[PDB]
Each structure stands twice: as C-alpha cells, then as structure tokens.
Design an enzyme around this catalytic site. Structure first.
Site, mmCIF file in Angstrom:
data_model
loop_
_atom_site.group_PDB
_atom_site.id
_atom_site.type_symbol
_atom_site.label_atom_id
_atom_site.label_comp_id
_atom_site.label_asym_id
_atom_site.label_seq_id
_atom_site.Cartn_x
_atom_site.Cartn_y
_atom_site.Cartn_z
ATOM 1 N N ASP A 1 12.050 -2.730 7.252
ATOM 2 C CA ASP A 1 11.798 -1.363 6.808
ATOM 3 C C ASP A 1 12.653 -0.380 7.613
ATOM 4 O O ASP A 1 13.529 -0.774 8.388
ATOM 5 C CB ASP A 1 10.293 -1.059 6.799
ATOM 6 C CG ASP A 1 9.701 -0.810 8.194
ATOM 7 O OD1 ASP A 1 8.479 -0.560 8.278
ATOM 8 O OD2 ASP A 1 10.415 -0.856 9.214
ATOM 9 N N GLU B 1 8.619 3.725 -1.562
ATOM 10 C CA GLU B 1 8.740 2.462 -0.847
ATOM 11 C C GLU B 1 9.658 1.452 -1.517
ATOM 12 O O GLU B 1 10.109 0.520 -0.841
ATOM 13 C CB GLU B 1 7.358 1.810 -0.670
ATOM 14 C CG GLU B 1 6.378 2.635 0.141
ATOM 15 C CD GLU B 1 6.725 2.707 1.610
ATOM 16 O OE1 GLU B 1 6.049 3.463 2.337
ATOM 17 O OE2 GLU B 1 7.665 2.013 2.061
HETATM 18 K K K Z 1 10.287 0.417 2.099
#
Ligand code: K
Ligand code: V1A
Ligand code: CL
Ligand code: CL
Ligand code: CL
Length: 164
Positions: A20, A11
């Site tokens: 994202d 992440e």
């Molecule tokens: K991310």
C-alpha cells in the site's frame, strides 16, 4: 455513490498481494494484511482471512467479501469509540461516509486522535474543519485522497467522486 463505491475508488482493486501507500502488504480493496515486512507473515494472514491456502492471489468475490467485512469493522469501530460515536451520530449520511473512509484508512484510534477536527465537525463549521483536517500527516502523505474526503466533509455532497 455510497461508502462502498467511494472506498472502491479510493483503494482500487488488486487480486495479488501488493504494498500500500505506506509500504504495507495489502490485497483486494485496501485490505491491510500486516505491518510486518515479512511476506511470509502477510501470506499467513491472507490464508487465515480467506480460510484456504492461497498462492497470494484471491478472486474478485473473495476481495469483495473481505471488503464488506472491513467496511462493517470500520463502522463498528466508530460506534464503540467514545470520541467518534457522537461525531458520527451528529453527521448526515454523506459526511458519515467521509468518516468511515478515514477510519478504514487509518483505524479507529488514529481518527479518534483528531480531537480539534472532530470538534469542528460536531460544530458543523465545515470550512474550518476542512482547513484543520489538512494540517495532518494524513493530508501530506495522501493529498489527493485526503482532498476528496475533505471536500466531502466540507460540502456534504459527492462532488469529489462524481467524475471518477
Ligand atoms: K490501496
Ligand atoms: S502467499 C506467498 N508466500 C511466499 C513467500 C512463498 N510467496 O512468495 C507468496 C506466493 C507471495
Ligand atoms: Cl480479516
Ligand atoms: Cl445538528
Ligand atoms: Cl485550523
């Protein structure tokens, strides 16, 4: 390696609101704020999550606090779900991290829908499960991350995260 180090690799860490891979406002270590296209809505979610008026920027300690809560929530989602819990209980600790990773990225309901993959995992048919898991929007949209998670299910080792 452990689930925290694994998700930190997958992440990243960013201290300002960003979008994202799906275009959704996010902060920290993959903390999804909202699916709404309204930046103001994302900002309100951030202030509520942190407990103070932010300017869209948080500290590293604040990012790690949300991350700990989010890993905890992914585990709780697995344990409360009638489809995910038996699979999780059947797995070794490395493969448990792979499942937590999927739930962190896609949510409890999404992963619980992988009925055939979950059955192959419960059967410990690792190569077959790996093939089935790749026949997914998940793999097509995030193939390098999905390949790492799938390799973890296939092998029960951390080999896909070692030189990272
Ligand atoms: K991310
Ligand atoms: S947080 C935040 N809310 C508004 C829309 C004013 N922003 O531009 C920030 C600073 C990202
Ligand atoms: Cl939150
Ligand atoms: Cl067994
Ligand atoms: Cl298949």
């Amino acid at each position: 390696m452990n689930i925290f180090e694994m998700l930190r690799i997958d992440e990243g860490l960013r201290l300002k609101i960003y979008k994202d891979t799906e275009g959704y406002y996010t902060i920290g270590i993959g903390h999804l704020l909202t699916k709404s296209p309204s930046l103001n809505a994302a900002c309100s979610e951030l202030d509520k999550a942190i407990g103070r008026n932010t300017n869209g920027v948080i500290t590293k300690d604040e990012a790690e606090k949300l991350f700990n809560q989010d890993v905890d929530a992914a585990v709780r989602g697995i344990l409360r779900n009638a489809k995910l819990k038996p699979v999780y209980d059947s797995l070794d600790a490395v493969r448990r991290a792979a499942l937590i990773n999927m739930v962190f990225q896609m949510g409890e309901t999404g992963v619980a829908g992988f009925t055939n993959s979950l059955r192959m995992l419960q059967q410990k048919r690792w190569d077959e499960a790996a093939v089935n898991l790749a026949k997914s929007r998940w793999y097509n949209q995030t193939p390098n991350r999905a390949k790492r998670v799938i390799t973890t299910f296939r092998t029960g080792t951390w080999d896909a995260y070692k030189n990272l």
